[PDB]
Design a protein around this motif. Structure first.
Motif, PDB file in Angstrom:
ATOM      1  N   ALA B   1       0.828  -1.200   0.000  1.00 48.70           N
ATOM      2  CA  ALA B   1       0.000   0.000   0.000  1.00 48.70           C
ATOM      3  C   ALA B   1       0.866   1.255   0.000  1.00 48.70           C
ATOM      4  O   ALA B   1       2.059   1.193   0.287  1.00 48.70           O
ATOM      5  N   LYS B   2       0.248   2.394  -0.309  1.00 49.15           N
ATOM      6  CA  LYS B   2       0.956   3.669  -0.306  1.00 49.15           C
ATOM      7  C   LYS B   2       1.179   4.103   1.136  1.00 49.15           C
ATOM      8  O   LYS B   2       0.521   5.025   1.629  1.00 49.15           O
ATOM      9  N   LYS B   3       2.113   3.444   1.812  1.00 47.98           N
ATOM     10  CA  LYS B   3       2.373   3.687   3.221  1.00 47.98           C
ATOM     11  C   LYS B   3       3.861   3.539   3.502  1.00 47.98           C
ATOM     12  O   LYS B   3       4.598   2.908   2.742  1.00 47.98           O
ATOM     13  N   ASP B   4       4.292   4.131   4.612  1.00 48.64           N
ATOM     14  CA  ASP B   4       5.672   4.004   5.052  1.00 48.64           C
ATOM     15  C   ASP B   4       5.966   2.587   5.531  1.00 48.64           C
ATOM     16  O   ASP B   4       5.078   1.861   5.985  1.00 48.64           O
ATOM     17  N   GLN B   5       7.235   2.203   5.434  1.00 50.10           N
ATOM     18  CA  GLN B   5       7.689   0.907   5.917  1.00 50.10           C
ATOM     19  C   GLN B   5       8.355   0.976   7.282  1.00 50.10           C
ATOM     20  O   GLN B   5       8.329  -0.014   8.020  1.00 50.10           O
ATOM     21  N   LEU B   6       8.949   2.116   7.638  1.00 43.17           N
ATOM     22  CA  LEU B   6       9.475   2.290   8.987  1.00 43.17           C
ATOM     23  C   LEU B   6       8.349   2.521   9.987  1.00 43.17           C
ATOM     24  O   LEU B   6       8.192   1.763  10.950  1.00 43.17           O
ATOM     25  N   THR B   7       7.560   3.567   9.779  1.00 43.36           N
ATOM     26  CA  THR B   7       6.351   3.780  10.551  1.00 43.36           C
ATOM     27  C   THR B   7       5.170   3.217   9.765  1.00 43.36           C
ATOM     28  O   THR B   7       5.337   2.594   8.713  1.00 43.36           O
ATOM     29  N   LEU B   8       3.959   3.430  10.273  1.00 41.88           N
ATOM     30  CA  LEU B   8       2.756   2.946   9.606  1.00 41.88           C
ATOM     31  C   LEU B   8       1.857   4.088   9.152  1.00 41.88           C
ATOM     32  O   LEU B   8       0.704   3.847   8.776  1.00 41.88           O
ATOM     33  N   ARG B   9       2.359   5.319   9.177  1.00 40.62           N
ATOM     34  CA  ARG B   9       1.554   6.479   8.822  1.00 40.62           C
ATOM     35  C   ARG B   9       1.170   6.423   7.349  1.00 40.62           C
ATOM     36  O   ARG B   9       2.033   6.289   6.476  1.00 40.62           O
ATOM     37  N   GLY B  10      -0.128   6.521   7.074  1.00 41.86           N
ATOM     38  CA  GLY B  10      -0.628   6.384   5.728  1.00 41.86           C
ATOM     39  C   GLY B  10      -1.405   7.595   5.254  1.00 41.86           C
ATOM     40  O   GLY B  10      -1.199   8.720   5.718  1.00 41.86           O
ATOM     41  N   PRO B  11      -2.318   7.381   4.310  1.00 40.56           N
ATOM     42  CA  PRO B  11      -3.059   8.503   3.728  1.00 40.56           C
ATOM     43  C   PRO B  11      -4.000   9.151   4.731  1.00 40.56           C
ATOM     44  O   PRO B  11      -4.353   8.581   5.765  1.00 40.56           O
ATOM     45  N   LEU B  12      -4.405  10.376   4.403  1.00 41.74           N
ATOM     46  CA  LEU B  12      -5.338  11.153   5.209  1.00 41.74           C
ATOM     47  C   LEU B  12      -6.526  11.534   4.340  1.00 41.74           C
ATOM     48  O   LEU B  12      -6.372  12.283   3.370  1.00 41.74           O
ATOM     49  N   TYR B  13      -7.703  11.024   4.687  1.00 44.52           N
ATOM     50  CA  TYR B  13      -8.914  11.304   3.932  1.00 44.52           C
ATOM     51  C   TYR B  13      -9.599  12.551   4.474  1.00 44.52           C
ATOM     52  O   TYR B  13      -9.703  12.742   5.689  1.00 44.52           O
ATOM     53  N   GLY B  14     -10.065  13.397   3.564  1.00 36.22           N
ATOM     54  CA  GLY B  14     -10.706  14.632   3.951  1.00 36.22           C
ATOM     55  C   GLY B  14     -11.628  15.131   2.860  1.00 36.22           C
ATOM     56  O   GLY B  14     -11.965  14.400   1.927  1.00 36.22           O
ATOM     57  N   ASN B  15     -12.026  16.394   2.985  1.00 32.35           N
ATOM     58  CA  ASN B  15     -12.950  17.013   2.046  1.00 32.35           C
ATOM     59  C   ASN B  15     -12.203  17.955   1.110  1.00 32.35           C
ATOM     60  O   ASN B  15     -11.183  18.542   1.475  1.00 32.35           O
ATOM     61  N   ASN B  16     -12.719  18.099  -0.104  1.00 34.37           N
ATOM     62  CA  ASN B  16     -12.159  19.023  -1.087  1.00 34.37           C
ATOM     63  C   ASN B  16     -13.165  20.172  -1.182  1.00 34.37           C
ATOM     64  O   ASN B  16     -14.088  20.137  -1.996  1.00 34.37           O
ATOM     65  N   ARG B  17     -12.995  21.183  -0.335  1.00 34.47           N
ATOM     66  CA  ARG B  17     -13.883  22.339  -0.340  1.00 34.47           C
ATOM     67  C   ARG B  17     -13.471  23.323  -1.425  1.00 34.47           C
ATOM     68  O   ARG B  17     -12.285  23.614  -1.595  1.00 34.47           O
ATOM     69  N   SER B  18     -14.457  23.825  -2.165  1.00 28.04           N
ATOM     70  CA  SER B  18     -14.218  24.838  -3.184  1.00 28.04           C
ATOM     71  C   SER B  18     -15.106  26.047  -2.930  1.00 28.04           C
ATOM     72  O   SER B  18     -15.800  26.108  -1.910  1.00 28.04           O
ATOM     73  N   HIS B  19     -15.083  27.017  -3.838  1.00 26.99           N
ATOM     74  CA  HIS B  19     -16.073  28.083  -3.798  1.00 26.99           C
ATOM     75  C   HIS B  19     -17.463  27.490  -3.972  1.00 26.99           C
ATOM     76  O   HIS B  19     -17.657  26.542  -4.738  1.00 26.99           O
ATOM     77  N   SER B  20     -18.427  28.047  -3.236  1.00 25.81           N
ATOM     78  CA  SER B  20     -19.783  27.527  -3.023  1.00 25.81           C
ATOM     79  C   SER B  20     -19.777  26.353  -2.054  1.00 25.81           C
ATOM     80  O   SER B  20     -20.821  25.708  -1.873  1.00 25.81           O
TER      81      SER B  20
END
Ligand SMILES: [Mg+2]
Ligand SMILES: [Mg+2]
Ligand SMILES: [Mg+2]
Ligand SMILES: [Mg+2]
Ligand SMILES: [Mg+2]
Ligand SMILES: [Mg+2]
Ligand SMILES: [Mg+2]
Ligand SMILES: [Mg+2]
Ligand SMILES: [Mg+2]
Ligand SMILES: [Mg+2]
Ligand SMILES: [Mg+2]
Ligand SMILES: [Mg+2]
Ligand SMILES: [Mg+2]
Ligand SMILES: [Mg+2]
Ligand SMILES: [Mg+2]
Ligand SMILES: [Mg+2]
Ligand SMILES: [Mg+2]
Ligand SMILES: [Mg+2]
Ligand SMILES: [Mg+2]
Ligand SMILES: [Mg+2]
Ligand SMILES: [Mg+2]
Ligand SMILES: [Mg+2]
Ligand SMILES: [Mg+2]
Ligand SMILES: [Mg+2]
Ligand SMILES: [Mg+2]
Ligand SMILES: [Mg+2]
Ligand SMILES: [Mg+2]
Ligand SMILES: [Mg+2]
Ligand SMILES: [Mg+2]
Ligand SMILES: [Mg+2]
Ligand SMILES: [Mg+2]
Ligand SMILES: [Mg+2]
Ligand SMILES: [Mg+2]
Ligand SMILES: [Mg+2]
Ligand SMILES: [Mg+2]
Ligand SMILES: [Mg+2]
Ligand SMILES: [Mg+2]
Ligand SMILES: [Mg+2]
Ligand SMILES: [Mg+2]
Ligand SMILES: [Mg+2]
Ligand SMILES: [Mg+2]
Ligand SMILES: [Mg+2]
Ligand SMILES: [Mg+2]
Ligand SMILES: [Mg+2]
Ligand SMILES: [Mg+2]
Ligand SMILES: [Mg+2]
Ligand SMILES: [Mg+2]
Ligand SMILES: [Mg+2]
Ligand SMILES: [Mg+2]
Ligand SMILES: [Mg+2]
Lengths: 111, 64
Positions: B1-20
């Motif tokens: 997976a797209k993750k570190d091999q030393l630590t286990l810190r991976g992706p961060l899911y969030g919102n894509n806020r735009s105008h409006s």
RNA sequence: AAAUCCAGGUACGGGUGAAGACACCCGUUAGGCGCAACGGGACGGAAAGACCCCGUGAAGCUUUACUGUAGCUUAAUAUUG
RNA sequence: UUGUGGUAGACGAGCGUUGUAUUGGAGUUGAAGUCAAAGCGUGAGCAUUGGUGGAUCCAAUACAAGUGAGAAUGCCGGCAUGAGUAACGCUUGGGAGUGAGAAUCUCCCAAACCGAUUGACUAAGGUUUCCUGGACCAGGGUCGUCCUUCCAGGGUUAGUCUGGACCUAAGCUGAGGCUGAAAAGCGUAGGCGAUGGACAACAGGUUAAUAUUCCUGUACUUACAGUUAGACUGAUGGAGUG
RNA sequence: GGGUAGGUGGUAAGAACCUCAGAUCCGGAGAUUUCCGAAUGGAGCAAUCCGGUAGUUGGAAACAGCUAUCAUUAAUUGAUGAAUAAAUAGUCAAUUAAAGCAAUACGUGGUGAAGUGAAACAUCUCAGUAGCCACAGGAAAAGAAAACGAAUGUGAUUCCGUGUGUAGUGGCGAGCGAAAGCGGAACAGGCCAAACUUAUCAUUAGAUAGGGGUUGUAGGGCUUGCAAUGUGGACUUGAAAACGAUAGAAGAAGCUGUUGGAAAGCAGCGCGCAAAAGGGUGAUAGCCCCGUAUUUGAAAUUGUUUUCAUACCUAGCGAGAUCCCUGAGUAGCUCGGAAAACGUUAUUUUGAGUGAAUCUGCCCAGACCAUUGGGUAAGCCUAAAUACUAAUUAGUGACCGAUAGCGAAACAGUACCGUGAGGGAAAGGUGAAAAGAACCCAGAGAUGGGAGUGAAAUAGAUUCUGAAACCAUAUGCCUACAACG
């Protein structure tokens, strides 16, 4: 132990037959019944069936047998007492043999 | 997976806020980059670590 | 067996009526009940009209309708001397 | 004295069902239920008697509700109407017999259709529908003594046939491994995967039902051991053929 | 172990046996436990096929019986060992764990919509809900202040009521909605890193194994003394005792007459009660039976608590020195998001970048600065109150009583429908006792009419009661010139 066993004399205290003395020939504990000889005579209309070596004859007419009777209607009959009566029994354990024995409560007669 | 091999810190899911203020789910991925870490002069494995962990290794004289 | 069926003992002419009547008003005709026929009517039966309109209903499609976005492209920054 | 038509609607007073709490009462000399009758009320409703029925029920005062059915092309069950109507889905006559009963069952003689097929062998599928005896609850678009229906018993025999113990095609699975928030996706070595390749049995007979399988006759193939004679044997790999 | 005189599971009679040297039955502990299934020797279309290895018994061998073992991953250890000298990668062997399932229920985390509302809709709501996935546990999560917050204040976390629909937050619209404080349930605080020191590693240790330490009215280390041998734990083994759980034993008290098929009803005269809960017995039984109140009892397994000893942890107040240590890619800051009631903002968190200080230190008290005050981040563990019931025991119901109650009172997730996921019914009652109608007549038979049993056969297996629609029969009246809600 049990109030009524196979062999002891017994009478009926309710029903059409009152004061019917007899000997218990067989006891069904599961159905709480008791076959007493000479009492509850029913006469099945015996048909004729012939499919076996014994069924080739199977002579059966108006055979009168024994119908089972509820154990509640039965009451033990006293014999040791000079004046015989119907009573209830205890379950004392005498230390001579350490075995439970039925004893009447209106007298001191064993079994 | 797209993750570190030393630590286990991976992706961060969030919102894509735009105008409006329109909401669309997005994912931030870690800056996975290839690095080789020596260990007792041997086994120079080409592990895939983030830049943050790479900086930590650099300031630790390549210790992990 | 079947769809159908508010209960029916269920005529015709003129008029009337929610505006085209087996049933209302006025007249005419007609013994009770079948069977074989043919379809005039019962705005006959089957399908909560597909046409039209309404609903601040649905869905598909289109675009220089609006707001966004996958993808493509450009720059800064980190890996990067 | 003034009043009393009435939808939407507002207000007031009551009936009825089930159960609970307090009191009292009836009931195998017959309770509820249930049917009938020529009763009582202003209305929801309430009694009396008789038949059936066989064990619970009633009155009063309060309390709590899954508490009131004529309609929803309402749900379920039953029964009508259409109506003894349409229909009964390609094939004849007779003789003898069984049977309580025969156009329909059995046998025989014809007769009519199929005959590149309604004939015969099998794959797939079906899963006992196959054979014998008995039966006519139900099913058979009629009938039935009869059936592919039901009951009881029985029936399928392989070294050579069809497939495994042999091999691979499309494709599937796939240790490691790669990729991916997770589940997982891809994929190497290996392993599966016939509709293909390689491999030794033919003729006749037999039971109601099995037959390259059982029997008779004549054969063939592959393993292992002993033995005789000859020969140096030569693969997990290379090559040819396949 | 308990317990008896019957038993050989139901539709179930009969045949044949077992059982008083103690059967069947109930309870505790064990034995055996085919094949598929995580399935794990290999495969595969589940309940099938094909094996290897090491033994042992028959054979002259092939072979055939009878045993044990043979999956993968991870950790530890040992052996072997490439490109390439060494060394790793790799290979092999041994040992220890993991796989899976379910409780239609609770917990944590990741991901995460839409119908709908706003009377349209995009911010918003729905909602961090449904769903998908991972990990558990008997609960989980949280947790011992770099805190609340405005005071001569409280002093881990969790849950309940109020504060209140308040302060606030919202195309300021629909809506959303705390944190303090107060009253309660329970209550518990412990332990590492660094200093300093010991021993050992080609001691380049910057590593391993010990002593010392765990903080905020700052603590600890350095040097120097007094007082201490205790109290208490979230703690190990044992011994003893008590209270239970899994079978059981004992357990009082009624006759007569009447209607009746049958008494227990009714009436007369009595009796017992720490038992008048309930069930059965031919109607409605305190005294017919089983039971109930009450008194009791365990060989074996198991639960809770207490006592004793025994490990492990656990200990105060001074003086001087002015020296050392107190958790870094960390706290902050910038760019995009989010958590909190907040639609992003003081506080919390992070994808990218940058990046501090060291008790005269750092963080906080809703931008921010100064004064005052509060607290010690970047390390860990933590019982109790809290959430839920598939299951075991006892019990209750102004809950249901075969169209109701679970879809399923009967053999129901069955019959049946569909390729499949999936969808999914109806159906209970003879009689006190089968005593289930022998026998006669008609008929081919089923069956019907008598007979017989029974209180009742119009209770007859079509089996409690039997309503209406519907179909037939009949006493009485009317109806074939008649226009009919
Ligand atoms: Mg949205
Ligand atoms: Mg007009
Ligand atoms: Mg319409
Ligand atoms: Mg619209
Ligand atoms: Mg809409
Ligand atoms: Mg670029
Ligand atoms: Mg009025
Ligand atoms: Mg009432
Ligand atoms: Mg009556
Ligand atoms: Mg209702
Ligand atoms: Mg109909
Ligand atoms: Mg008809
Ligand atoms: Mg007609
Ligand atoms: Mg006709
Ligand atoms: Mg016709
Ligand atoms: Mg035909
Ligand atoms: Mg014909
Ligand atoms: Mg021809
Ligand atoms: Mg043919
Ligand atoms: Mg069949
Ligand atoms: Mg046949
Ligand atoms: Mg036959
Ligand atoms: Mg027929
Ligand atoms: Mg042969
Ligand atoms: Mg194969
Ligand atoms: Mg083939
Ligand atoms: Mg044949
Ligand atoms: Mg014993
Ligand atoms: Mg929406
Ligand atoms: Mg809306
Ligand atoms: Mg709306
Ligand atoms: Mg915990
Ligand atoms: Mg007892
Ligand atoms: Mg007693
Ligand atoms: Mg009683
Ligand atoms: Mg700050
Ligand atoms: Mg939010
Ligand atoms: Mg300070
Ligand atoms: Mg301030
Ligand atoms: Mg600190
Ligand atoms: Mg039901
Ligand atoms: Mg029903
Ligand atoms: Mg099926
Ligand atoms: Mg009769
Ligand atoms: Mg009937
Ligand atoms: Mg009946
Ligand atoms: Mg007349
Ligand atoms: Mg006339
Ligand atoms: Mg007229
Ligand atoms: Mg008239």
């Amino acid at each position: 132990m049990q109030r009524i066993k196979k062999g002891d004399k017994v009478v009926v205290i309710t029903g059409k037959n009152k004061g019917g003395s007899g000997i218990v020939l067989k006891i069904m504990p599961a159905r709480q019944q008791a076959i007493v000889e000479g009492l509850n005579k029913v006469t099945r209309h015996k048909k004729k069936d012939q499919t076996t070596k014994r069924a080739a004859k199977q002579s059966t007419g108006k055979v009168q047998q024994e119908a089972p009777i509820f154990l509640s209607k039965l009451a033990l009959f006293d014999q040791k007492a000079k004046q015989q009566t119907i009573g209830k029994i205890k379950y004392v354990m005498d230390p001579k043999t350490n075995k439970k024995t039925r004893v009447f409560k209106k007298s001191n007669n064993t079994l | 997976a797209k993750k570190d091999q030393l630590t286990l810190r991976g992706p961060l899911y969030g919102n894509n806020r735009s105008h409006s203020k329109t909401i669309t789910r997005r994912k931030w991925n870690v800056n996975l980059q290839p690095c080789k870490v020596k260990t007792a002069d041997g086994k120079t494995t080409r592990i895939l670590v983030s830049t943050r962990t790479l900086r930590t290794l650099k300031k630790h004289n390549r210790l992990s």
